[PDB]
RNA sequence: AGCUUUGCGCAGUGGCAGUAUCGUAGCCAAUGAGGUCUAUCCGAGGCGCGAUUUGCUAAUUGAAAACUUCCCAAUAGCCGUGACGACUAGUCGGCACUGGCAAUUUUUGACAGUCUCGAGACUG
């Protein structure tokens, strides 16, 4: 219930956390993570599965690349974003 | 977009032979498509630099109900070293692609 | 049986809609409905069955 | 000529489908299968055996879940510094940067909001 106020930055923040969005001597910060071309966070399986692809000299074949590009320009869709035609039918 | 299939396409009909053995059945596709009324061709897809086919063939009969039934009698036969699976070639083109994405969105 | 045929229901009305309009969080009202909900919905498993506390 | 019936097949909507749908090559069967009601009456298959075509799409597993050579590298701003040439220790034009470029006149933003009839006013 709390509006984007102008010219204020704490009332973006709450409206976000109510709706959910959020020896020599060192300490060597040894972060290790997977990720792609695109640059996305790859699963564990996927990681493996690239792994794997690139170890074995050998990737996946046409329909799976093609299944697998289909599935990313969903979830694209998908993440970017029929009622007015129902409000209208009715 | 490989020139390769302007010899055997003539309207004819394409059957995909897989399932066969990668170091065999090299010109005994040719011997089946002799068997076969059409004997028209029999294009065994393998890589260059490769020794060995890459499994699943071409075969190009111009008889269709020739075709069909030899489709029916040859389907599991044993040939060379393993039963070949016939079924219907795809043949995806570039025309092709362009017709299905223009059928998806009407 | 009746919560079977519920939740093939529900599943054949989220396989209706398109991906695009299909959601990824179901609200079960009733807690003897979200199990069969896990079931009938194993071909898509983006979704996300969970309960409801305040029933509406 | 209009209209209508039975049977049949094609096409189509809707519906059903494991007490459902068939084969049966086995046997019996209008020369009567099966009958607790209506039995000097009804009138069809019944019993055993054995089944429940094709295309598309999606998803999971897996390195790869099958359509015709693939891969790798490359092309298609300023201030000063060191030399080069010119003009009278200074200036200019081109070359690469061994350092810097968020503190008032240019590039790390004094911008943003509101109201009225291209223009004006108010606030932070």
Redesign the interface.
């Given at each position: 219930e709390e509006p984007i106020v102008n010219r204020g930055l704490a009332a973006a923040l709450l409206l976000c956390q109510n709706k959910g969005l959020l020896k020599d001597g060192y300490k060597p910060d040894v972060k290790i993570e997977y990720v792609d071309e695109t640059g996305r966070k790859l699963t564990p399986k996927e990681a493996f599965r690239q792994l794997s692809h690139r170890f074995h000299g050998k990737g996946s074949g046409k329909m799976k690349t093609e299944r697998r590009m289909k599935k990313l320009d969903?979830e694209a869709?998908?993440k970017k974003?029929?009622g007015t035609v129902a409000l209208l039918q009715e | 977009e490989d020139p390769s299939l302007l010899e055997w396409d003539a309207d004819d009909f394409r059957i995909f032979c897989g399932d066969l053995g990668n170091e065999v059945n090299d010109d005994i596709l040719a011997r089946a498509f002799s068997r076969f009324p059409s004997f028209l061709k029999a294009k065994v897809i393998r890589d260059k630099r490769t020794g060995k086919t890459k499994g699943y063939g071409f075969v190009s009969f111009k008889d269709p109900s020739d075709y069909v039934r030899a489709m029916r009698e040859m389907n599991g036969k044993y040939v060379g070293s393993r039963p070949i699976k016939l079924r219907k070639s795809m043949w995806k083109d570039r025309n092709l692609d362009v017709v299905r994405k223009k059928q998806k969105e009407k | 049986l009746a919560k079977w045929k519920t939740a093939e229901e529900v599943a054949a009305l989220i396989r209706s809609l398109p991906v695009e309009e299909q959601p990824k969080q179901i609200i079960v009202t009733r807690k003897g409905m979200l199990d069969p909900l896990e079931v009938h919905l194993l071909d898509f498993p983006n979704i996300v069955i969970k309960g409801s506390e305040l029933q509406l």
């Open positions: 969903e869709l998908l974003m029929l | - | -």
